[PDB]
Amino acid sequence: SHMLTNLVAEPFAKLEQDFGGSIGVYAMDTGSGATVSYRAEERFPLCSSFKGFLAAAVLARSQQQAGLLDTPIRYGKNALVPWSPISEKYLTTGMTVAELSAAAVQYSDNAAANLLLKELGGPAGLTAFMRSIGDTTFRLDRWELELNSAIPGDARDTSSPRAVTESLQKLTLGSALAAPQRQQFVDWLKGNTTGNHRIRAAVPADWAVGDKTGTCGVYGTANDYAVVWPTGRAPIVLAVYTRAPNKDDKHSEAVIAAAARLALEGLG
Ligand SMILES: O=C(Nc1nnn[nH]1)c1cc(-c2ccccc2)n(-c2ccccc2)n1
């Protein structure tokens, strides 16, 4: 589908010129097979958007570990990382593995993320899971909050919008997860609360959307990926990532939404 990529090439370049940074977009229409690419193979910092794959990784481990999702996890005050709005409310009680996973996806809870990263063997364990579903691009290298440095040219804690999309499609529509675990992942993504102004702001009001956002902040680095379900039609999977050369460059949610629109425009 080289035709549709060329259709939106000039609009995408004008958008990233207005933003003053780089924009990486990949989108595939599972109803036709048409794809749109713009910097889709370049590396962008994952930021918080890794927590979606972190939850899918926990779901795959629950398959051969029955009752993993129900295992209570108690944690002290030192386990609290800045921006842990869900975990700091159960500090005196604890939470379940499934609760921590839903908090990491839907609220980007950081203490919950590090607690789950520890459950999987650290960032290498999550990287191991993505390789095991066919993703050779994804890599996680550090924990919260070190993974958010978004240093120009640093491949640590990065993936490509295409690999993100391809892996998201495998885990939400393909066979990387079993039918029970697949629906829970889609359900966790559908209930995300942090993405109202990104991909969700780019789709019609009747579309069902599951997404996970990321906001390094520095270097104008923010992102969003989603599986969107048009009414009575096959779903589209897409990923939109941005970065910028200067540490104090500001990210733009509006730019992310506008990029999600141009990709849907490219696919129809
Ligand atoms: O990515 C993020 N958030 C999100 N976006 N979409 N969903 N969640 C996100 C949040 C934060 C953060 C900010 C303040 C306090 C605690 C954490 N940092 C962060 C962490 C360290 C250095 C620079 C940025 N990055």
Side-chain angles (χ1 to χ4, degrees), residues 134-209:
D135 195 321
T136 47
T137 310
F138 178 98
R139 69 181 273 188
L140 204 69
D141 299 79
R142 300 165 287 175
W143 310 63
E144 296 284 356
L145 309 144
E146 275 76 31
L147 54 89
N148 298 293
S149 48
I151 298 176
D154 183 6
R156 294 181 298 170
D157 314 290
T158 62
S159 193
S160 73
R162 170 167 211 183
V164 165
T165 299
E166 288 168 340
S167 292
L168 186 62
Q169 196 228 329
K170 281 161 184 184
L171 295 156
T172 61
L173 313 174
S175 51
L177 292 169
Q181 290 76 1
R182 193 192 316 152
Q183 190 47 258
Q184 258 283 18
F185 190 38
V186 164
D187 284 337
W188 282 340
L189 290 165
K190 281 167 125 191
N192 181 40
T193 82
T194 72
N196 292 349
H197 306 280
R198 290 167 199 202
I199 290 174
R200 282 179 192 276
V203 300
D206 40 305
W207 284 25
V209 174

Coordinates of all heavy atoms in Angstrom, one line a residue, residues 134-209:
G134 N 6.9 -12.1 18.3 CA 7.4 -11.7 17.0 C 7.9 -10.3 16.9 O 8.2 -9.8 15.8
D135 N 8.0 -9.5 18.0 CA 8.4 -8.1 18.0 C 9.9 -8.1 18.3 O 10.3 -8.3 19.4 CB 7.6 -7.3 19.0 CG 7.7 -5.8 18.8 OD1 8.9 -5.4 18.5 OD2 6.7 -5.1 19.0
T136 N 10.7 -7.8 17.3 CA 12.1 -7.6 17.4 C 12.6 -6.2 17.6 O 13.8 -5.9 17.8 CB 12.9 -8.2 16.1 OG1 12.2 -7.7 15.0 CG2 12.8 -9.7 16.2
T137 N 11.7 -5.2 17.5 CA 12.0 -3.8 17.7 C 11.8 -3.3 19.1 O 12.7 -2.6 19.6 CB 11.1 -3.0 16.8 OG1 11.1 -3.5 15.4 CG2 11.5 -1.5 16.7
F138 N 10.8 -3.7 19.8 CA 10.5 -3.3 21.1 C 11.7 -3.5 22.0 O 12.3 -4.6 22.0 CB 9.2 -3.9 21.6 CG 8.8 -3.6 23.0 CD1 7.9 -2.6 23.2 CD2 9.4 -4.2 24.1 CE1 7.5 -2.2 24.5 CE2 9.1 -3.8 25.4 CZ 8.1 -2.9 25.6
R139 N 12.0 -2.6 22.9 CA 12.9 -2.8 24.0 C 12.6 -1.9 25.1 O 12.4 -0.7 25.0 CB 14.4 -2.6 23.5 CG 14.8 -1.2 23.2 CD 16.2 -1.2 22.8 NE 17.2 -1.1 23.9 CZ 18.5 -0.9 23.8 NH1 19.0 -0.7 22.6 NH2 19.2 -0.8 24.9
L140 N 12.5 -2.5 26.3 CA 12.4 -1.7 27.6 C 13.7 -1.9 28.3 O 14.3 -3.1 28.4 CB 11.3 -2.2 28.5 CG 10.8 -1.1 29.5 CD1 10.1 0.0 28.7 CD2 9.9 -1.7 30.5
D141 N 14.3 -0.9 28.8 CA 15.6 -0.9 29.5 C 15.6 -0.5 30.9 O 16.5 -1.0 31.7 CB 16.6 -0.1 28.7 CG 16.8 -0.6 27.2 OD1 15.9 -0.3 26.4 OD2 17.8 -1.3 27.0
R142 N 14.8 0.4 31.3 CA 14.8 0.9 32.7 C 13.4 0.9 33.3 O 12.4 0.5 32.6 CB 15.3 2.4 32.7 CG 16.8 2.5 32.1 CD 17.1 3.9 31.8 NE 16.5 4.4 30.6 CZ 16.5 5.6 30.2 NH1 17.3 6.5 30.8 NH2 15.9 6.0 29.0
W143 N 13.3 1.3 34.6 CA 12.0 1.3 35.3 C 11.5 2.8 35.4 O 12.2 3.7 35.0 CB 12.2 0.8 36.7 CG 12.9 -0.5 36.8 CD1 14.2 -0.8 36.4 CD2 12.4 -1.8 37.3 NE1 14.5 -2.2 36.7 CE2 13.4 -2.7 37.2 CE3 11.1 -2.1 37.9 CZ2 13.2 -4.1 37.7 CZ3 10.9 -3.4 38.3 CH2 12.0 -4.4 38.2
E144 N 10.3 2.9 35.9 CA 9.8 4.2 36.2 C 10.6 4.8 37.4 O 10.8 4.0 38.4 CB 8.3 4.2 36.6 CG 7.4 3.8 35.4 CD 7.2 4.9 34.4 OE1 7.7 6.0 34.6 OE2 6.5 4.6 33.4
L145 N 11.1 6.0 37.3 CA 10.8 6.9 36.2 C 11.9 7.1 35.2 O 11.9 8.1 34.5 CB 10.3 8.2 36.7 CG 9.2 8.2 37.8 CD1 9.4 9.3 38.8 CD2 7.8 8.3 37.1
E146 N 13.0 6.3 35.3 CA 14.2 6.5 34.4 C 13.9 6.4 33.0 O 14.6 7.0 32.1 CB 15.3 5.6 34.9 CG 16.1 6.2 36.0 CD 15.4 6.0 37.4 OE1 14.6 5.0 37.5 OE2 15.5 6.8 38.3
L147 N 12.9 5.6 32.6 CA 12.7 5.3 31.2 C 12.1 6.5 30.4 O 12.0 6.4 29.2 CB 11.7 4.1 31.0 CG 10.3 4.1 31.8 CD1 9.3 4.8 30.9 CD2 9.9 2.7 32.2
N148 N 11.8 7.6 31.0 CA 11.2 8.7 30.4 C 12.2 9.8 29.9 O 11.8 10.9 29.5 CB 10.2 9.3 31.3 CG 9.1 8.4 31.7 OD1 8.3 8.0 30.9 ND2 9.0 8.0 33.0
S149 N 13.5 9.5 29.9 CA 14.5 10.5 29.6 C 14.3 11.0 28.1 O 14.6 12.2 27.9 CB 15.9 10.0 29.8 OG 16.1 8.7 29.2
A150 N 13.9 10.2 27.2 CA 13.6 10.5 25.8 C 14.8 11.2 25.1 O 14.7 12.1 24.3 CB 12.4 11.4 25.7
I151 N 16.0 10.7 25.5 CA 17.2 11.4 25.0 C 17.3 11.2 23.5 O 17.1 10.1 23.0 CB 18.5 10.8 25.7 CG1 18.4 11.1 27.2 CG2 19.8 11.3 25.1 CD1 19.5 10.4 28.0
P152 N 17.6 12.2 22.7 CA 17.8 12.1 21.2 C 18.8 11.1 20.8 O 20.0 11.2 21.2 CB 18.2 13.5 20.8 CG 17.7 14.4 21.9 CD 17.8 13.6 23.1
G153 N 18.4 10.1 20.0 CA 19.3 9.1 19.5 C 19.5 7.9 20.4 O 20.1 6.9 20.0
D154 N 18.9 8.0 21.7 CA 19.0 6.9 22.6 C 18.0 5.8 22.3 O 16.8 6.1 22.3 CB 18.9 7.4 24.0 CG 19.0 6.3 25.1 OD1 19.4 5.2 24.7 OD2 18.8 6.7 26.3
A155 N 18.4 4.6 22.0 CA 17.5 3.5 21.7 C 16.8 2.9 22.9 O 15.9 2.1 22.8 CB 18.1 2.5 20.8
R156 N 17.3 3.3 24.1 CA 16.7 2.7 25.3 C 15.2 3.0 25.5 O 14.8 4.2 25.3 CB 17.5 3.1 26.6 CG 18.9 2.6 26.6 CD 19.6 3.1 27.9 NE 19.7 4.5 27.9 CZ 20.1 5.2 29.0 NH1 20.4 4.6 30.1 NH2 20.2 6.5 29.0
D157 N 14.4 2.0 25.8 CA 13.0 2.3 26.1 C 12.3 2.9 24.9 O 11.6 3.9 25.0 CB 12.8 3.1 27.3 CG 13.6 2.6 28.5 OD1 13.3 1.5 29.0 OD2 14.5 3.3 28.9
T158 N 12.5 2.3 23.7 CA 11.9 2.8 22.5 C 11.3 1.7 21.7 O 11.7 0.5 21.8 CB 12.9 3.5 21.6 OG1 13.9 2.6 21.2 CG2 13.6 4.7 22.3
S159 N 10.3 2.0 20.8 CA 9.9 1.1 19.7 C 9.6 2.0 18.5 O 9.8 3.2 18.5 CB 8.8 0.2 20.1 OG 8.6 -0.8 19.2
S160 N 9.1 1.3 17.5 CA 8.6 2.0 16.3 C 7.1 2.0 16.2 O 6.5 1.0 16.7 CB 9.2 1.4 15.0 OG 8.6 0.1 14.7
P161 N 6.5 3.0 15.7 CA 5.0 3.0 15.5 C 4.5 1.8 14.8 O 3.4 1.3 15.1 CB 4.7 4.3 14.8 CG 5.9 5.2 15.1 CD 7.1 4.3 15.3
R162 N 5.2 1.3 13.8 CA 4.8 0.1 13.1 C 4.9 -1.1 14.0 O 3.9 -1.9 14.1 CB 5.7 -0.2 11.9 CG 5.5 -1.5 11.2 CD 6.1 -1.6 9.9 NE 5.4 -2.4 9.0 CZ 5.7 -2.7 7.7 NH1 6.8 -2.1 7.2 NH2 5.0 -3.5 6.9
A163 N 6.0 -1.3 14.8 CA 6.1 -2.5 15.7 C 5.0 -2.4 16.8 O 4.4 -3.4 17.2 CB 7.5 -2.6 16.2
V164 N 4.8 -1.2 17.3 CA 3.8 -1.0 18.3 C 2.4 -1.4 17.7 O 1.7 -2.2 18.4 CB 3.8 0.5 18.8 CG1 2.5 0.8 19.5 CG2 5.0 0.7 19.6
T165 N 2.1 -0.9 16.5 CA 0.8 -1.3 15.9 C 0.7 -2.8 15.6 O -0.3 -3.4 16.0 CB 0.7 -0.5 14.6 OG1 0.7 0.9 14.8 CG2 -0.6 -0.9 13.9
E166 N 1.8 -3.4 15.0 CA 1.7 -4.8 14.7 C 1.6 -5.6 16.0 O 0.8 -6.6 16.0 CB 3.0 -5.2 14.0 CG 3.1 -4.7 12.6 CD 4.4 -4.8 11.9 OE1 5.4 -5.0 12.7 OE2 4.5 -4.8 10.7
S167 N 2.3 -5.3 17.1 CA 2.1 -6.0 18.3 C 0.8 -5.8 19.0 O 0.2 -6.7 19.6 CB 3.2 -5.6 19.3 OG 4.5 -6.1 18.8
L168 N 0.3 -4.6 18.9 CA -1.1 -4.3 19.4 C -2.1 -5.1 18.7 O -3.1 -5.6 19.3 CB -1.3 -2.8 19.3 CG -2.7 -2.3 19.9 CD1 -2.7 -2.5 21.4 CD2 -2.9 -0.8 19.7
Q169 N -2.0 -5.2 17.4 CA -2.9 -6.0 16.6 C -2.9 -7.5 17.0 O -3.9 -8.2 17.1 CB -2.7 -5.8 15.1 CG -3.9 -6.3 14.3 CD -3.4 -7.2 13.1 OE1 -2.3 -7.1 12.6 NE2 -4.3 -8.2 12.7
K170 N -1.6 -8.0 17.2 CA -1.5 -9.4 17.6 C -2.1 -9.7 19.0 O -2.7 -10.7 19.2 CB 0.0 -9.8 17.6 CG 0.6 -10.0 16.3 CD 2.1 -9.9 16.3 CE 2.7 -10.1 14.9 NZ 4.2 -10.1 14.9
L171 N -2.0 -8.7 19.9 CA -2.5 -8.9 21.3 C -4.0 -8.6 21.5 O -4.6 -9.0 22.4 CB -1.7 -8.1 22.3 CG -0.2 -8.5 22.4 CD1 0.6 -7.3 22.9 CD2 0.0 -9.7 23.3
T172 N -4.6 -7.8 20.6 CA -6.0 -7.5 20.7 C -6.9 -8.1 19.7 O -8.0 -8.4 19.9 CB -6.2 -5.9 20.6 OG1 -5.7 -5.5 19.3 CG2 -5.4 -5.2 21.7
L173 N -6.3 -8.4 18.5 CA -7.1 -9.1 17.4 C -6.6 -10.4 17.0 O -7.3 -11.3 16.6 CB -7.2 -8.2 16.2 CG -7.6 -6.7 16.5 CD1 -7.6 -5.9 15.3 CD2 -9.0 -6.6 17.2
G174 N -5.2 -10.6 17.1 CA -4.6 -11.9 16.7 C -4.7 -13.0 17.7 O -5.7 -13.1 18.4
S175 N -3.6 -13.8 17.8 CA -3.6 -15.0 18.6 C -2.5 -15.0 19.7 O -2.2 -16.0 20.3 CB -3.4 -16.2 17.7 OG -2.3 -16.0 16.8
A176 N -1.9 -13.8 19.9 CA -0.8 -13.8 20.9 C -1.3 -14.0 22.3 O -0.6 -14.5 23.2 CB -0.1 -12.4 20.8
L177 N -2.6 -13.7 22.6 CA -3.2 -14.0 23.8 C -4.4 -14.9 23.6 O -5.0 -14.8 22.5 CB -3.7 -12.7 24.5 CG -2.6 -11.8 25.1 CD1 -3.3 -10.4 25.5 CD2 -1.9 -12.4 26.2
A178 N -4.8 -15.7 24.6 CA -6.0 -16.5 24.4 C -7.2 -15.7 24.4 O -7.2 -14.5 24.8 CB -6.0 -17.6 25.6
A179 N -8.3 -16.3 24.0 CA -9.6 -15.6 23.9 C -10.0 -15.0 25.2 O -10.5 -13.8 25.2 CB -10.7 -16.6 23.4
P180 N -9.9 -15.6 26.4 CA -10.2 -14.9 27.7 C -9.3 -13.8 27.9 O -9.8 -12.7 28.2 CB -10.1 -16.0 28.7 CG -10.2 -17.3 28.0 CD -9.5 -17.1 26.6
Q181 N -8.0 -13.9 27.8 CA -7.1 -12.9 28.2 C -7.1 -11.8 27.1 O -6.9 -10.6 27.5 CB -5.7 -13.4 28.3 CG -5.4 -14.3 29.5 CD -6.1 -15.7 29.4 OE1 -6.6 -16.0 28.3 NE2 -5.9 -16.5 30.4
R182 N -7.4 -12.1 25.9 CA -7.5 -11.1 24.8 C -8.6 -10.1 25.2 O -8.4 -8.8 25.0 CB -7.7 -11.7 23.5 CG -7.5 -10.8 22.3 CD -8.0 -11.4 21.0 NE -7.7 -12.8 20.9 CZ -8.4 -13.7 20.3 NH1 -9.5 -13.4 19.7 NH2 -8.0 -15.0 20.2
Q183 N -9.8 -10.5 25.6 CA -10.9 -9.6 25.8 C -10.6 -8.8 27.1 O -11.0 -7.6 27.1 CB -12.2 -10.4 26.0 CG -13.4 -9.6 26.1 CD -13.5 -8.5 25.0 OE1 -13.2 -7.4 25.2 NE2 -13.9 -9.0 23.8
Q184 N -9.9 -9.3 28.1 CA -9.6 -8.5 29.2 C -8.6 -7.3 28.9 O -8.8 -6.2 29.4 CB -9.0 -9.3 30.3 CG -9.9 -9.7 31.5 CD -10.1 -8.6 32.4 OE1 -9.8 -7.4 32.1 NE2 -10.6 -8.9 33.6
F185 N -7.7 -7.6 28.0 CA -6.8 -6.6 27.5 C -7.6 -5.5 26.8 O -7.4 -4.3 27.0 CB -5.7 -7.2 26.6 CG -4.6 -6.2 26.2 CD1 -4.1 -5.3 27.1 CD2 -4.0 -6.3 25.0 CE1 -3.1 -4.5 26.8 CE2 -3.0 -5.4 24.6 CZ -2.5 -4.5 25.5
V186 N -8.4 -5.9 25.8 CA -9.3 -4.9 25.1 C -10.1 -4.2 26.1 O -10.3 -2.9 26.0 CB -10.1 -5.7 24.1 CG1 -11.3 -4.8 23.6 CG2 -9.3 -6.1 22.9
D187 N -10.6 -4.8 27.1 CA -11.4 -4.2 28.1 C -10.6 -3.2 29.0 O -11.1 -2.1 29.3 CB -12.1 -5.2 29.0 CG -13.3 -5.9 28.3 OD1 -13.8 -5.3 27.4 OD2 -13.7 -7.0 28.7
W188 N -9.4 -3.6 29.4 CA -8.6 -2.6 30.1 C -8.3 -1.4 29.2 O -8.3 -0.3 29.7 CB -7.3 -3.3 30.5 CG -7.4 -4.1 31.7 CD1 -8.4 -4.1 32.6 CD2 -6.5 -5.2 32.1 NE1 -8.2 -5.0 33.6 CE2 -7.0 -5.7 33.3 CE3 -5.3 -5.7 31.6 CZ2 -6.4 -6.8 34.0 CZ3 -4.7 -6.8 32.3 CH2 -5.3 -7.3 33.5
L189 N -8.0 -1.6 27.9 CA -7.7 -0.5 27.0 C -8.9 0.4 26.8 O -8.8 1.6 26.6 CB -7.1 -1.0 25.7 CG -5.7 -1.7 25.7 CD1 -5.5 -2.4 24.4 CD2 -4.7 -0.6 25.9
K190 N -10.1 -0.2 26.6 CA -11.3 0.5 26.4 C -11.6 1.5 27.6 O -12.2 2.6 27.4 CB -12.5 -0.4 26.1 CG -12.5 -0.9 24.7 CD -13.5 -2.1 24.6 CE -14.5 -1.8 23.5 NZ -15.6 -2.8 23.5
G191 N -11.2 1.1 28.8 CA -11.5 1.9 30.0 C -10.4 2.9 30.3 O -10.4 3.3 31.5
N192 N -9.5 3.2 29.4 CA -8.4 4.1 29.7 C -9.0 5.5 29.9 O -10.0 5.9 29.2 CB -7.5 4.2 28.5 CG -6.3 5.2 28.7 OD1 -5.8 5.3 29.9 ND2 -5.9 5.9 27.7
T193 N -8.5 6.3 30.8 CA -9.0 7.5 31.2 C -8.1 8.7 30.9 O -8.5 9.9 31.0 CB -9.2 7.6 32.8 OG1 -7.9 7.8 33.4 CG2 -9.7 6.2 33.2
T194 N -6.9 8.4 30.3 CA -5.9 9.5 30.1 C -5.8 9.9 28.6 O -5.0 10.7 28.3 CB -4.5 9.0 30.5 OG1 -4.0 8.0 29.6 CG2 -4.6 8.4 31.9
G195 N -6.7 9.3 27.7 CA -6.5 9.6 26.3 C -7.6 10.3 25.6 O -7.6 10.2 24.3
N196 N -8.4 11.1 26.3 CA -9.5 11.8 25.7 C -9.1 12.8 24.6 O -10.0 13.1 23.8 CB -10.3 12.5 26.8 CG -11.0 11.5 27.7 OD1 -11.1 10.3 27.5 ND2 -11.6 12.0 28.8
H197 N -7.9 13.3 24.7 CA -7.5 14.4 23.8 C -6.6 14.0 22.7 O -5.9 14.8 22.0 CB -6.9 15.6 24.5 CG -7.8 16.1 25.6 ND1 -8.9 16.9 25.4 CD2 -7.8 15.8 27.0 CE1 -9.5 17.2 26.5 NE2 -8.9 16.6 27.5
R198 N -6.4 12.6 22.5 CA -5.4 12.2 21.5 C -6.2 11.4 20.4 O -7.1 12.0 19.8 CB -4.3 11.4 22.1 CG -3.4 12.3 22.9 CD -2.4 11.6 23.9 NE -1.9 12.4 24.9 CZ -0.8 12.2 25.6 NH1 -0.1 11.1 25.3 NH2 -0.4 13.0 26.5
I199 N -6.0 10.1 20.3 CA -6.7 9.3 19.2 C -8.2 9.4 19.4 O -8.9 9.4 18.5 CB -6.2 7.9 19.2 CG1 -4.7 7.8 18.7 CG2 -7.0 7.0 18.4 CD1 -4.1 6.4 18.8
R200 N -8.6 9.4 20.7 CA -10.1 9.4 21.0 C -10.7 10.7 20.5 O -11.9 10.7 20.1 CB -10.3 9.3 22.5 CG -10.2 7.9 23.0 CD -10.4 7.9 24.5 NE -10.0 6.6 25.1 CZ -10.8 5.5 25.1 NH1 -12.0 5.5 24.6 NH2 -10.3 4.4 25.6
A201 N -10.0 11.8 20.4 CA -10.5 13.1 19.9 C -10.5 13.1 18.4 O -11.0 14.1 17.8 CB -9.7 14.2 20.5
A202 N -10.0 12.1 17.7 CA -9.9 12.0 16.3 C -10.9 11.1 15.6 O -11.0 11.1 14.4 CB -8.5 11.6 15.9
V203 N -11.7 10.3 16.4 CA -12.6 9.3 15.8 C -14.0 9.8 16.0 O -14.3 10.6 16.9 CB -12.4 8.0 16.5 CG1 -10.9 7.5 16.2 CG2 -12.7 8.0 17.9
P204 N -14.9 9.3 15.1 CA -16.4 9.7 15.3 C -16.9 9.3 16.7 O -16.4 8.4 17.4 CB -17.1 9.0 14.2 CG -16.0 8.8 13.1 CD -14.7 8.6 13.9
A205 N -18.0 10.0 17.1 CA -18.6 9.8 18.4 C -19.0 8.3 18.6 O -19.1 7.9 19.8 CB -19.7 10.7 18.6
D206 N -19.4 7.6 17.6 CA -19.9 6.2 17.8 C -18.9 5.1 17.8 O -19.2 4.0 18.0 CB -21.0 6.0 16.7 CG -20.6 6.5 15.3 OD1 -20.3 7.7 15.2 OD2 -20.5 5.7 14.4
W207 N -17.6 5.5 17.6 CA -16.5 4.5 17.5 C -16.1 4.0 18.9 O -15.9 4.8 19.8 CB -15.3 5.1 16.8 CG -15.5 5.2 15.3 CD1 -16.6 5.3 14.6 CD2 -14.4 5.2 14.4 NE1 -16.3 5.4 13.3 CE2 -15.0 5.3 13.1 CE3 -13.0 5.1 14.5 CZ2 -14.2 5.3 11.9 CZ3 -12.3 5.1 13.3 CH2 -12.9 5.2 12.1
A208 N -16.0 2.7 19.1 CA -15.5 2.1 20.3 C -13.9 2.2 20.2 O -13.4 1.8 19.2 CB -15.9 0.7 20.5
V209 N -13.3 2.6 21.3 CA -11.8 2.8 21.3 C -11.2 2.2 22.5 O -11.7 2.4 23.6 CB -11.5 4.3 21.2 CG1 -10.0 4.6 21.3 CG2 -12.0 4.9 19.8

